[PDB]
Structures are given as C-alpha cells and as structure tokens.
Paper text:
Class IA PI3Ks signal downstream of tyrosine kinases, G protein-coupled receptors and small GTPases to regulate cell metabolism, growth, proliferation and migration. They consist of a p110α, β or δ catalytic subunit and a p85 regulatory subunit (further referred to as PI3Kα, PI3Kβ and PI3Kδ), with a broad tissue distribution (p110α, p110β) or enriched in leukocytes (p110δ). PI3Kα phosphorylates PIP2 in the plasma membrane to PtdIns(3,4,5)P3 (or PIP3), which can be converted by 5-phosphatases to PtdIns(3,4)P2. Here we report on the discovery of UCL-TRO-1938 (further referred to as 1938), a small molecule activator of the PI3Kα isoform, a critical effector of growth factor signalling.
We next attempted to crystallize full-length p110α/niSH2-p85α in the presence of 1938. Class IA PI3K activation upon binding to phosphorylated tyrosine motifs in proteins occurs through the release of inhibitory interactions between p85 and p110, by: (1) release of p85α-nSH2 and p85α-iSH2 from the p110α-helical and p110α-C2 domains, respectively; (2) movement of the N-terminal p85-binding domain in p110α relative to the rest of the catalytic subunit and (3) interaction of the p110α kinase domain with the lipid membrane.
Author numbering:
A (entry chain A): 3 to 313, 322 to 501, 523 to 864, 871 to 1065
B (entry chain B): 326 to 591
C-alpha cells in the first residue's frame, strides 16, 4: 500500500540534489545533477554549458531556441513554456527532460495546461473521446461562455467589479423586528475609515444614518462630516456631494467584501450581522479608481475544437406498432465464489425516475462460470407509450438458495441506459455496457438513481445487449405533434377546491393515495389556480401512457412559476422529464437570488448527476451564474473539483470544469494558486501519514518546520485566497503558530497573516485546519443545513445564534475546516475547573465578570436552544462532552456530526427518535444562572419557548429541507441513499400529524429524554395561553 | 372475521416497513395497516401493481367502510375478501387486479419459535453479536476494496507514463542513429578514434537506460497483475458475505421485534 503521487512517481519528495537525464536534439544524453528546487531556466543553462563537452555539440542552437518537454504523472507529454517553474513543481513521472524547439499555438497550449492543472486532468484527454455527445457538449456549451463574458464586460469597469466583487446581501431588505429594535430609531452607527496620503495614516469618521441608506448615501454623509469645518453655500454643498458621491466605494475593513451596489446598507450581510450582534461596522472608503485599476481584463478566446469539421427514413416513435423488447446476450465475467452461489441472472426494469413504468423482468438463471443468456426480454409496454425520459436499469445478480425455499439475491454490478439518446433517437442495435460496482449500503437489486452510461474502466464486467430495430432511425415526436395530440385526447366544487388546497399543503414525501391521484388528474385544469400542487399532479400522471403525458405537457407549458423552495423538488431524481425540469429551471431563472443560489449550491451541483444528458437547461443555468458572479464561480469550481476522483461523474464534471475555466477570466490564476497550495499540503500530510507514521510527534514537528521553510513551499503556501472564503486573503505564514494536531489523520493547523491594511479591526488571524484522511461531505452538508436553519430563524425574528463554521470538501477525503477561536470542549472545561455540576457555570462566570455576565447567559441559552432543536430534527450522532463546545463569551455549539437520520435504526434495530443533545444539569444550571430548582425558573421557561418556536419554524419550512435532502440521494453518502432515509426527518418534524400534535410530540420527546421538566403555558385542549 | 385477527392486518407499521415487505414481489400482493396519520379509525391498504406499491385509503364513516364514495361495508375484513375473490374493477373500472397474495403475519413469526422471553433475549444477543462482528468485517473489506481500486488506477496511469517515456527514449536512439552515421564515416576518414567511441559510449548509455526503463515497466505490469487478482478476490468475498449479512440483519430485527411484542407495552 505505498504508491505515491509526490514530486516523482513513487516518491513523495525529491532529495536535495537529483540526477536528471537530459535528451539533447542531437541524440546525445547528458546526465545533470540538479538542485530539486532549481528553475528550468537554471537547468537549461547548466545543460547547454555541459553539452559542449559532448559529441556533435555544434548541431545545437542557442539555448534560447529551446524549451523542455517531459512526461508528467498524468502520463501526458507536457511542454514547459514557463521556464521559471521549479524542477520539484513539474510533476515529472521520472527525472528526465527532452530538449525541443517549441512549435504550435503557444497561447492555447499554455492556457490548456493551466486549465488541466486546475481541473486535475489533461484537456487533451477530451479530444480523444469518440462519443458524439461529449464533443457536442464541448462545442455547444461555448455559447454560454460567450454570453457570460459579454454580459460581464458590457458596463465596464463597473460590470467587471460586480463580477469579481458581487454584493454579499440578504435576500430581502425587510428587517425582522428583533433586528430593527436593536437600532436607534431606525438608525445605525457606522465607522468609516480612510487611508490618507502621503503617510497612509488612518482616519476615522463615526456616522449615524438610517439603515436604509444606499452606499452612495453613506458616502454622501461622509462628505458632509468631512467638509463640516470648511463651511460653504448649501447649494454648492448639496451639489458637491452630488458631483463626488459616485467617486468612492466602500469596503469591509479586514476582508475583500465591497458594497458596489445600491442595496440598502442593512441588507448587506456584514452590516445585518453587525446590527444583530451589537458590533461596530467598520468600513473603508476608497476612490472608485483605485479599485477599477486593479480589475484584470478578462478576455475569452474561442478554443480550437470550435474550429473543426465533424463529419431520410426518420420514423416517429408513435407509429412504431410493437411492444418493447430488449435482448440480453452475454456478459464477459462476474466475480463470484462458485461454491457460494447457485446461479446468476440479469435483472432489468424500465424506469421513469425512481418509478418502474412496467414490471421488472429477469433473464433465466444460468451457471456462474458461463454468463450467457441470448434472451429477448418482453416488457409490458407499447413502444409509443415510452415517455421521453425512459431508462433501462439493469444488474447482474447472483442467487443462492440453500435454506428451505428461501433464497438470497445479491446485485454484483449495475448499469443504466437512456432509451433515447441526446438527439431524441430511440436506441437500436447492439450495445456493450461496462457495469459499475454496487454502492456500499445499497441492497436493492437495481440502482435506478445511479448515473447512466458505460463504466469508462473497461476492466470490469461487460454486458452485451441488443435493442430492437425498425429498419429506420426512430425519433421521439416533435412538440407540435405532441401538442396537437393532446387536444384529441381531451375530446361539489367547493369541497373539491378546498381538498386540492389541502393536498397541496402537504410535504413532498407525503403519501398520496390512488384515490387522490385519480382525483388530481381529473381536476388537472383547475390545478393552475394552486400552482404549487404541480409536483403532486405530476406524480399522479401515468407516465407509461402517451395520452396522459401529452396532456401533462400542455399544462406545464403555461404553468405559473412557483417559488424556488418548491421548484427545486422538480430537479431531484423523481422528476426526469425534460419539460418538467425546464419549467423548474425557468423558476430558478426568475426567482432564485444569487444569495439563495450560493446557499443551495451544494444541492444544485449534485442534481446535475441526475440529468440524462451532458447538455441540459440546468447546467447552462448554473454555468452562466458561475460565470457572472465570482463568489458563485469559486464554490461552483470547488464542489465540482472535489468530486473529480469519482469516475461516475468525472467526465461530466470535467467537461463542465473545462468550460468554466476557459471563461472565468483571471480568477483561473487565483484558483491555480489554491490548487497548488492544496497539492503541497496533501503531499506533506501524505508523508506524515505514510513514511513518518511510526515516528514521534517531536520528530514530526522538526520535519514539518524544515519543509515549510523551503522556498518552493513558501512560494506556494503564501499569498493566495482561502478556499473556505476567497474574500479572505492568505498572506505570509506564521510558522510559529503552525502545527500538526494530535488526532490520527494528522490534521495541520495553519495560521496566516492577513495582508488587508485594516486587519486589526477584523480577522487579524486567518486560521485553517487542513485535514487529509476523513470524508468531510457529511459535516459540510450538516453545517450547511444548520446555516439554513439559522437563517430561517433570524428571518422570523428568532435570534438563535448558531455556529455553522466553514467546512469545505476539496477532494477525496480531504478538506478545510474553519478554526473557531476562544472555544473549548465541555470536557476540557471540566478538566480545568475535579468537577461538579456547577463547574461549567463557574467557568462561564470567570470569563464574563460584571455587567457582561447576563449577555453570556443569554447567548448560551439561545445557542443552546438552537442546537437542541437542530440536533433533534436531524438526528445527529449522540452528543458527549468531547463534541460539544463553548466560547468564552458563552456561545455553545456542536462539532463532528458524522452521523445522522436513522443510521442507528439500521445498525441496532431500535425503532426510536433519539434526543441526541440531552441537556444535563450542567447546562440547566447555566441557563438558570445557578438556581437550585432549574426547571421552574423564568429563564428555563424562556429557553423552552425558544425551543418550541424554533421547532415550529423549521416544521413550517419542511418542504425546503425535504427537498434539499432529496436532492442528495445520488451523492454517494451511505447515510443518504433512498427516500426511506429521509423518512426520519418526516418523523422528527411529525409531518403526518397536525402542527399542534407535532408540538405536543416535540415536548413529549424532550420530557422522555430529560425525565420531566418540560411544561406547557397552554391549556391542553386549545393550546391557548393560560398564564401571566 | 375481526380486523385484529386478520393475517394481513399489520397494525402500526410504517410505509417503509411495507415497502420492504412488498419489495420485488408479484402483482396482487397486498396488506392493510393503520393510516400514517394515526387518526384511530383510518386504515391503509397497500397493493402491489406493475412493480409499484399502491396506497389505497379505507374510508371509515358511520358504521361503514369503502374504497370509493359509496360506503358499503361494515368491517375491514368484509371489504378485503369481497375484492379478494372478485375483480377490482368495482373500485375503478381501469386495470382491475383484485387482491390475490396476502403478506401474512403468521409465516413470519414461525421464524422465532422460542417459548420464553429469556430464550428470545439470549438468541437476540447472539445474533446481534454476530451481526456487529460481521458488519465490521465487511466494512473492513470494503476499505481494502476501495484502497485496492485506487492503487490499480494509479498503476494503470503509471504504465501509460512508462509507455510514453519509453517511446521518447526510443526516439532518441533513432535520432542518434540518423545523425551519428554520417560522422562515424568521417571520424574514421579523418583518423579520430576516441571521438568515435565517445559517440558509441553515449549510445551504449542510452541503450542501457531504455532497457532499465523497460524492465521497470515490466515489473509494474507484474504487480498490476497480482493486485488485479487480489481485487477480484476481495470482490468475491464481499459478494459471498453481502447476502448472508443482509439475512442476519433481518433475523436480528425479527427477534428484537419479537422481544418487544412479548414485553410490556405503553
């Protein structure tokens, strides 16, 4: 288990000096001893000096006439045009260099190498792909690239600044009451800083303005205060302000977050946070010009592959008068133990999303050692009834029948195929399909949620199929044809209206009866009056009848758009129809704010895996957004890149990343600095986890220290943007604060200076944990959900302070984690109290003496309520004093989630909804400020109502969370695999109960788990206030 | 004749529990359970049709019961049998299938034949123990499978890199041969012998270099072969224990349910 992807194949680090084989153009070979960090400029020069001592030396030209080519660890022939790169940074397969005269389109070659580096794969690999769908994607997606780059450079330089520095804003300007009341009669105090020439002194202005004010008005007020002493005519003043108002721009002190857009100030997230937290907003004023000057010109260039030439009886599907027939021929091999298995067979099914369009069909059973069927399988479906998104889902299965009449079936390998290709052609003739390994945890014989297409790895079980032929190319019919047919397919009410409404208010995974379906379908024209019933109407549709589908098409054509929160459902694995999904994208296009798109990016990227084809409306929409807003583009890039190792999506994500990198402008050089930083950190931790694993910590710190001081390491790990938040610039490393953490995977705790000139006001330290070895996708998802919960609560005037710290997966079990400062585990706290129940409260007291004591209690209480409710709903793996933390100012939060939903049911069998975060007496004592009888205090009653409100607020937004989890089923998370996995949150949110029953259920859970203490200020009959 | 003693009436089991039971079964398979609302009167019939589980609400008003609006029954048992013999076109005239295979409580509980709560408890302990053990093994195997898969990919990519490398060194040889021949003819014709051997010496060096690189690739091909064999054996062993591990889990879940049932309830 020791192969390495370091500086050479098989070697993590080059020795300080190394022999490099140099292949001269005259056929000679010169062995040169090189410093591992020497540049190619040095090496080339040293080589051509030495080459004089070798034969046929006169045939060599000026060294300036040549560059180096070699083989990289990706087995590409790479030409080294940038001779300032270091030998150790080249990613050589083996230490040799070949001398050639540079040919060809240099600028394209250089840009393709930069793209290749960014995405983790040489773009030349794309040119080899025979699949017409792939080459068509590459060419056709370029339109979206051009449309974005044009739209970016249109209103220059302002439209460019907006692309690079988009406004970080909330989704509405509307202030919740708990926020507004913290203002001073609707006004905020802000501090505006200016760097004055010539000594770059810092001057401070404290302003008091309406929260409403646009940045330009903030600047206006600043001009007023500045010219206070130099008194003038009010008209010249009002006109002075008017003339120079748009001469400056505002910036958050400490990070690269600008206010370039006329949103009200309080709608900016930084400012909104400052109000909520009672923190002084510190902004920096600068001339518009000193920003617009920085902004790189982004030029987009049409690639070569857009400049190449690529080389009658077309029957409507609907006039093919036959049943569906598919032939299973043979499979090359299975890996089974012949002694443990009786027979193998191929299982098949025709699907629309997760629903079978007819019954599944097995081949006959045959011996393990001879996988041959030659069988036409007959499906109970008429070829013209095949919906556009129909798929063949299959598996090779083993069967063992050794106990009674009982047998055990196991899928060995699976594969899905679109019945129509991306041009609406019904597949025909022979096909060979390389199958995929069955996902860990999956027990079903088919895997219909899985991606379609052949396993690119051709050293895998290969199934030969054959589809029917109709002596002609067969195509899905035109929209004109379908629309016409619907017309000719179509040739108490107060109770009905109120029942439809009731059906529409239920959650996406709510049971719908056959009665309700026939009811929905029969009132389909009336359903437009309640447009958000669309998902349920769609699932009432019989997708195996062209008659019904044609009619359903005519409805979604004119369907009124519905909110993003609901349209996203139509992009999960249950709604595969290209019209249905088009409608969904149109809703996103019109109503999804950039803020919400960023908020839900993780899910929107994941549902790309569900798309039948490379080219679709969703991917064009996402790429467009990624290319018109760089904060979206950054995370777009990193979410795609982090999965490039997963062969089920690396083609699709690779092609998508290529087109993004080609058009993203200068930000590609910033991303390349991030990727090389991450690559160095992977290599450094690989060494610690492999070579040096049986060494002590002290020795490991010695090695770490000497490595980080090397020029090639310093160069790469200083002066780049944080991938967690690229508004944070990572400057010089503070080596004395960097360290390897104690845990097993060997995380690195890294610390950078912030080169922002006003870093003392905010983020003096940028600290990150880099972790190589743990799968971080579940933490990232859980932290995301917490963030969304917190945002829901805030919007309802519910101030429950959560701490959804940054966690970013950046590749296969590798990621970054934000460091939360001044925070300690409960265990650590009890260990510095010997400790009773009161140690925690006492700890908190000492850290918040005097007037600030109550603030800490309050903050502890609110954060406690938020995590109590969030963990209950999500079923986070049980809490203990090591995965629960508290800050010095009393903010409580949780870490290390790594387990959720009904994972425990599947392991132990016990059918129960746990209460993961049980508030022990330690916590109760804090909330009650030390009272003897904690549950009977007003503070505990206040804490309770917080929990009740928080709970109902998430329940009221149940659609959003069910849809967000549903979009993850195809993700590769063992814990999040079927809709049955999402059933757990339907339980905790008590979605099949009334709201009042739901709150009753929540109180009953808390009581059972805390053994009493949770009381109602309602009467049990009407839930009306009975006290105070 | 009573709802409770009916073999297909399963009480308060979930949708999901029914999905598991009706999974991959034949058309006509059915069962009845409490509604997911738990409104104390409403029950749900679940029927297998065309590879799909159908939920049919059982409407309970006055003293009657009905699929459709005309409430024309008196017990749930009545209704199920009335459709169990005749066709289901009476419900809705489209694609009648009636009700032909019932998922029975009774064949399930024969799996657990221990008399006392202590006999059951003890066998639950054994099965649970075996299950957590055999889970652990299978998890361990999957990690090895995953590590082995990755390494094989690295090695495939490394073999391609050797192939490209070897090609380039072979090109150098051809380059050296294109050139040197017109010089050996001249260094002989002009007396120099040491310069000739410096050419030959560089050619020998290149030749031996190519031969070491070719052997290195040969050795990697051999390792790839061995590891490809380990990989398929790891796959065999996972294929062997998967179905046994599934069965065992259902047995554990069954005893646990059985224990629950013969324990105090509230």
């Amino acid at each position: 288990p020791r192969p390495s992807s370091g500086e050479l194949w098989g070697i993590h680090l080059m020795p300080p000096r190394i022999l490099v084989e140099c292949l001269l153009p005259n056929g000679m070979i010169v062995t040169l001893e090189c410093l591992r960090e020497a540049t190619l400029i040095t090496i080339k020069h040293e080589l051509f000096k030495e080459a004089r001592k070798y034969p046929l030396h006169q045939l060599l030209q000026d060294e300036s006439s040549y560059i180096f080519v070699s083989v990289t660890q990706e087995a590409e022939r790479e030409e080294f045009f940038d001779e300032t790169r270091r030998l150790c940074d080249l990613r050589l397969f083996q230490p040799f260099l070949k001398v050639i005269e540079p040919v060809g389109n240099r600028e394209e070659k250089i840009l393709n190498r930069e793209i290749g580096f960014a995405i983790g794969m040489p773009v030349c690999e794309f040119d080899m792909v025979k699949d017409p769908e792939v080459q068509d994607f590459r060419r056709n997606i370029l339109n979206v690239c051009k449309e974005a780059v044009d739209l970016r450079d249109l209103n220059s330089p302002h439209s460019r600044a907006m692309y690079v520095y988009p406004p970080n804003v909330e989704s509405s300007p509307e202030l919740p009451k708990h926020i507004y009341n913290k203002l001073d009669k609707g006004q905020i105090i802000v501090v505006i800083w200016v760097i004055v020439s010539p000594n770059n002194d810092k001057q401070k202005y404290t302003l008091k303005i309406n929260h409403d004010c646009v940045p330009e008005q903030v600047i206006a007020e600043a001009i007023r205060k500045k010219t206070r002493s130099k008194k003038l005519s009010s008209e010249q003043l009002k006109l002075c302000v008017l003339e120079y108002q748009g001469k400056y721009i505002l910036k958050v002190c400490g990070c690269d977050e600008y206010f370039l857009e006329k949103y009200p100030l309080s709608q900016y997230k930084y400012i909104r946070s400052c109000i909520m937290l009672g923190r002084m907003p510190n902004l920096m004023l600068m001339a518009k010009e000193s920003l617009y000057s920085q902004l790189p010109m982004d030029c987009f260039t049409m690639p070569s592959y857009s400049r190449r030439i690529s080389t009658t009886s077309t029957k409507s599907l609907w006039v093919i008068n036959s049943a569906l027939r598919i032939k299973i021929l043979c499979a090359t091999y299975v890996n089974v133990n012949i002694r443990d298995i009786d027979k193998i067979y191929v299982r098949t099914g025709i699907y629309h999303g997760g629903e079978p369009l007819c019954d599944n069909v097995n081949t006959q059973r045959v011996p393990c050692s001879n996988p041959r069927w030659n069988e036409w399988l007959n499906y109970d479906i008429y070829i013209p009834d095949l919906p556009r998104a129909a798929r063949l889902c299959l598996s090779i299965c083993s069967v063992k029948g050794r106990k009674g009449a009982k047998e055990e079936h196991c899928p060995l390998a699976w594969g899905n195929i679109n019945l129509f290709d991306y041009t609406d052609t019904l597949v025909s003739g022979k096909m060979a399909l390389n199958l995929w390994p069955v996902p860990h945890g999956l027990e079903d014989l088919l895997n219909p949620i899985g991606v379609t297409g052949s396993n690119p790895n051709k050293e895998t079980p290969c199934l030969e199929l054959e589809f029917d032929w109709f002596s002609s190319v067969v195509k899905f019919p035109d929209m004109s044809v379908i629309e016409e047919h619907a017309n000719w397919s179509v040739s108490l009410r107060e109770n009905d209206k109120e029942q439809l409404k009731a059906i529409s208010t239920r959650d996406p995974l709510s049971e719908i009866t056959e009665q309700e379906k026939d009811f929905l379908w029969s009132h389909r024209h009336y359903c437009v009056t309640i447009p958000e019933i669309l998902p349920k109407l769609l699932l009432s549709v019989k997708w195996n009848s062209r008659d019904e589908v044609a009619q359903m098409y005519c409805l979604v054509k004119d369907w009124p758009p519905i909110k993003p929160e609901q349209a996203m459902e139509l992009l999960d694995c249950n709604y595969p129809d290209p019209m249905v999904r088009g409608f969904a994208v149109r809703c996103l296009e019109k109503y999804l704010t950039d803020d919400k798109l960023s908020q839900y990016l993780i899910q929107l990227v994941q549902v790309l895996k569900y798309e039948q084809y490379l080219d679709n409306l969703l991917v064009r929409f996402l790429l467009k957004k990624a290319l018109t807003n760089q904060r979206i583009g950054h995370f777009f890039f990193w979410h795609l890149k982090s999965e490039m190792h997963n062969k089920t999506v690396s083609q699709r994500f690779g092609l998508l990343l290529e087109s993004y990198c080609r058009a993203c402008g200068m930000y590609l050089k910033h991303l390349n600095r991030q990727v090389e930083a991450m690559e160095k950190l992977i290599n450094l931790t690989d060494i610690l986890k492999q070579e040096k694993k049986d060494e002590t910590q002290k020795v490991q710190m010695k090695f770490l220290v000497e490595q980080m001081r090397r020029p090639d390491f310093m160069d790469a790990l200083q002066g780049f943007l944080s991938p967690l938040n690229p508004a944070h610039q990572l400057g010089n490393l503070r080596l004395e604060e960097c360290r390897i953490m104690s845990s097993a995977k060997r995380p690195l705790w890294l610390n950078w200076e912030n080169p922002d000139i006003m870093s003392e006001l905010l983020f003096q330290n940028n600290e990150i944990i880099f972790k190589n070895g743990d799968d971080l996708r579940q933490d990232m998802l859980t932290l995301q959900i917490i963030r969304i919960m917190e945002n829901i609560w805030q919007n309802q005037g519910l101030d429950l302070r959560m701490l959804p710290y940054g966690c970013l997966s950046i590749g296969d079990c590798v990621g970054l984690i934000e460091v939360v400062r001044n925070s300690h585990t409960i265990m650590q706290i009890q260990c510095k109290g010997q400790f009773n129940s009161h140690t925690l409260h006492q700890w908190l007291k000492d850290k918040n003496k005097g007037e600030i004591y109550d603030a800490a209690i309050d903050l502890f209480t609110r954060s406690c309520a938020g995590y109590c409710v969030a963990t209950f709903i999500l079923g986070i793996g049980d809490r203990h004093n090591s995965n629960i933390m508290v800050k010095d100012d009393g903010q409580l939060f949780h870490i290390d989630f790594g387990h959720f939903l009904d994972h425990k049911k599947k392991k132990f069998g016990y059918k129960r909804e746990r209460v993961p975060f049980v508030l022990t007496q330690d916590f109760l004592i804090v909330i009650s400020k030390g009272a003897q009888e904690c549950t009977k205090t007003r503070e505990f009653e206040r804490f309770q109502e917080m929990c009740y409100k928080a709970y109902l607020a998430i329940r009221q937004h149940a659609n959003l969370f069910i849809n967000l989890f549903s979009m993850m089923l195809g993700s590769g998370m063992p814990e999040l695999q079927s809709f049955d996995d999402i059933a757990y949150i339907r339980k905790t949110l008590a979605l099949d109960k009334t709201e009042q029953e739901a709150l009753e259920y929540f109180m009953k859970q808390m009581n059972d788990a805390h053994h009493g203490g949770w009381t109602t200020k309602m009467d049990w009959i009407f839930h009306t206030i009975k006290q105070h | 004749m009573s709802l409770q003693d009916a073999e297909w009436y399963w009480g308060d089991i979930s949708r999901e529990e029914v999905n598991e039971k009706l999974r991959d079964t034949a058309d006509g398979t059915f069962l009845v359970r409490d509604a997911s609302t738990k409104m104390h009167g409403d029950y749900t019939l679940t029927l297998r049709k065309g590879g799909n589980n159908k939920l049919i609400k059982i409407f309970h008003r006055d003293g009657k019961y009905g699929f459709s609006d005309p409430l024309t029954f008196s017990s749930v048992v009545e209704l199920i049998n009335h459709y169990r013999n005749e066709s289901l076109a009476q419900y809705n005239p489209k694609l009648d299938v009636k009700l032909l295979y019932p998922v029975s409580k009774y064949q399930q509980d024969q799996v657990v034949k221990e008399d006392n709560i202590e006999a059951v408890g003890k066998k639950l302990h054994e099965y649970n123990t075996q299950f957590q053990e055999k889970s652990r093994e299978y998890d361990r195997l999957y990690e090895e499978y995953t590590r082995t898969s990755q390494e094989i990919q690295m090695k495939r990519t490394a073999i391609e890199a050797f192939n490209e490398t070897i090609k380039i060194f072979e090109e150098q040889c051809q380059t050296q041969e294109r050139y040197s021949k017109e010089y050996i003819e001249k260094f002989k014709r002009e007396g120099n012998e040491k310069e000739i051997q410096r050419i030959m010496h560089n050619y020998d060096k290149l030749k031996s270099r190519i031969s070491e690189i070719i052997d290195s690739r040969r050795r990697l091909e051999e390792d790839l072969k061995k590891q490809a064999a380990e990989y398929r054996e790891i796959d065999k062993r996972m294929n062997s224990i998967k179905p046994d591990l599934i069965q065992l889990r259902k047995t554990r879940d069954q005893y646990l349910m059985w224990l629950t049932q013969k324990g105090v309830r509230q």
